[PDB]
């Protein structure tokens, strides 16, 4: 009766709000893919304006 | 029911069962010929038949094999006790018992037909009752394409029990029972709203405690200028749903490209310092999109705005993308510098916006290639860099330099520099 | 226990972002090499310029 109350309370934080620090962690992978496209643009739009202007 | 409402619900049935053209009927019941009579031209033909066969399959006693052949007051007052006040277990009961003549789970192909049988009729009752407040979006000869793409948006929140959404051509054949439609009317407020205006506006129950000022906004344009908008009435009933509730009543014209020129200097002059407004534009490939600003537009290099600014979409699909809080790069407005971009922008970062309108007017981009960062919003246009001809900025809710200095025009004439224009400008 | 095992859920918590910053430090130079694969898109204009010369 007593341990059935304290087994719920160790799910209050362990997989409910400490799991969201893992959810706030893997959405820097949404922010790192936007930076990757900036350099992908910054190297195309400085060279595709060059190696097509030659032709 | 309150006795203010219990008075006029029997005052609709007492006038119905006294039909003259239907001969074999009594005083306690009516038949289906007079239910397609008083509605007249306020409802389409595909709904007044479902007005019959959705009310007739009520079970009141518990013993009969199916529906009764004459609808009585007991079979009438209970169906508005299921719809106009009822709960979710009662509300979708008259959704599914409107679809098939047999009981059971209704298939996922023919709930789509009913969903395009409803939203084509809200624009039929609201136009015939003359409540459009100026928003008369022109019907297309043929099918209206905004009725179609709005109706399939509601079915995107149709969460089947599997947890996986309706994807691919296997989206038509789901045995959708009462287990799965009863959260759909719980999640989607408009399928609960639109049934309260197809029924309670042709039937003209004046005691109804609804709000029609906050469902359809009021179009406030200045008179004298013949002005049609990009957005028809089902679109402005879509964007108005995701605004704050306090502003949903009046959409005033701020800038439009076919009346105030095709200039960015006019755009930046008409939408700066006018509060929250909804920018909406349509490019060459018929992709209507845009965004909403929560605060005023102000010309400054910094990223301004807060978490109520959202991007949407209308004509390719209807979806709304709220903020994600990864960054607060919400709005942007710059007007003629050289190291930072000059134009209007929302989302993303510098030169990588999720919606951008440039100073060379009629151009822009939505370069959110995977998705956006601020708004989790896709590439909005068909291409990477679109071109547009129509733009609208709508606010929601609520001399020159040549004549400014008379000493400088005196010093310019004294210093030898001419005027270049007399008799070309007014005064 | 709880406070004897709460940091054991926090060390596993902090060891999920270090792979999210190591993947972020990789995704910069992951396809900068494929940002030199736009020098394969220069081929389709050259043989087309050889096609307008043809």
Author numbering:
A (entry chain d): 3 to 57
B (entry chain U): 16 to 413, 424 to 452
C (entry chain g): 6 to 59
Paper text:
The vacuolar-type H+-ATPases (V-ATPases), which localize to the plasma membrane, endosomes, and membrane-bound vesicles, are ATP-driven proton pumps which regulate intracellular pH homeostasis. V-ATPase is a rotary machine conserved from yeast to mammals. The V1 domain, containing sixteen subunits (A3B3CDE3FG3H), catalyzes the hydrolysis of ATP by the A3B3 heterohexamer to trigger the V1–Vo torque transmission via subunits DF. In this manuscript, we discovered that mEAK7, a lysosomal surface-anchored protein, can bind the V1 domain of intact V-ATPase and may function as an inhibitor of V-ATPase.
Since the yield of endogenous V-ATPase from HEK293 cells is low, we employed the endogenously purified V-ATPase from bovine brain to perform all in vitro assays. The mEAK7 binding sites are highly conserved in these two species. To confirm that bovine V-ATPase can be a competent substitute for human V-ATPase in these experiments, we purified human mEAK7 from E. coli and collected the cryo-EM data from a mixture of homo sapiens mEAK7 and bos taurus V-ATPase (hsmEAK7-btV-ATPase complex) at 10:1 molar ratio. The structural analysis showed that human mEAK7 could form a complex with bovine V-ATPase similar to human V-ATPase.
